[PDB]
Amino acid sequence: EEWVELGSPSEKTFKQRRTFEQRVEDVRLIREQHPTKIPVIIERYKGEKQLPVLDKTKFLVPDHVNMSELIKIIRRRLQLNANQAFFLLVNGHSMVSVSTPISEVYESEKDEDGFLYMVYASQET
Amino acid sequence: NEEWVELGSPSEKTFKQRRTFEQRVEDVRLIREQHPTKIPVIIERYKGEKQLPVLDKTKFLVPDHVNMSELIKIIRRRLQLNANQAFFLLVNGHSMVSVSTPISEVYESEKDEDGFLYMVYASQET
């Protein structure tokens, strides 16, 4: 009654922090200026406690990079021990084809907004 | 409905007629892996067309950055057109308004369900 609570207590994902048309606009600008890159959002699964939070959320991935190279890149950015379990979920599932360019993966897995969303965790769910 | 179907003269098969939907889905998979920064474009002459010649080659891997207005110039040159000859490059039956955006951008709005981008060239806009 005395103090007014603003916003919602829970951390918002990227998708949740931006309007659908903001997102669609962000992608337009990327496809226009970085036409050989794929726009990828990369977030730590909500309940995660073994893995650190990435420094950044918004990435541009060269068409040619495959999922296994991406996994290795993110493991290194996060400075993981080689023994630490790590999964990179694309729409809630690990990708089977880890040697196909992300430009191809993008065509099957991209969101309606044009972004490709990934979530990393120490369990595969 | 008692109206007649006036069949066209069967000519050379188009790309979709030569290949099944699954062979084309498979072709796109290969091509996307082999050329991740290119768009696979099928470019064929409008079946009704008289003014413009037929090009020998119909299957083009276009670099993502290339725009529609660069692509048009490429095709007008391969056809060896006179500079006054009307020419249109139709995507799903229409001229593209956006003529200095990357073809990779176009692709995402206009691609066929099989994953190829189809175009048809004509001396009228239809």
Numbering used by the authors:
A (entry chain B): 10 to 134
B (entry chain A): 9 to 134
What did the original publication write about this model?
In humans, the Atg8 family comprises six proteins grouped in two sub-families - Microtubule-associated proteins 1 light chain 3 (LC3A, LC3B, LC3C), and γ-aminobutyric acid receptor-associated proteins (GABARAP, GABARAPL1 and GABARAPL2). All receptors described to date interact with these Atg8-proteins through a conserved tetrapeptide motif called LIR motif (LC3 Interacting Region). Our cellular, biochemical and biophysical analyses, including a crystal structure of the LC3B:Nix-LIR complex, revealed that the LIR phosphorylation status is essential for the fine-tuning of the LC3B:Nix interaction and crucial for the initiation of Nix-mediated mitophagy.
The crystal of a chimeric construction containing a phosphomimetic (two Ser were substituted with Glu) Nix LIR motif (Nix residues 28–39) fused C-terminally to LC3B (residues 2–119), Nix-LIRS34,35E-LC3B2–119, was obtained using PEG/Ion Screen 2 condition No. Therefore, in the LIR bound state, the Glu34 residue very likely exists close to Arg10, Arg11 and Lys51 of LC3B and interacts with these side-chains. In our X-ray structure, it is Arg10 side-chain participating in intermolecular hydrogen bond to the phosphomimicking Glu34. Based on the crystal structure, we propose that Lys49 of LC3B shows a similar gating mechanism since the Lys49 side-chain in our structure also moves by approximately 6 Å relative to the free protein. We present here the first atomic detailed structure of phosphorylation-based regulation of interactions between mitochondrial autophagy receptors and Atg8 homolog proteins.
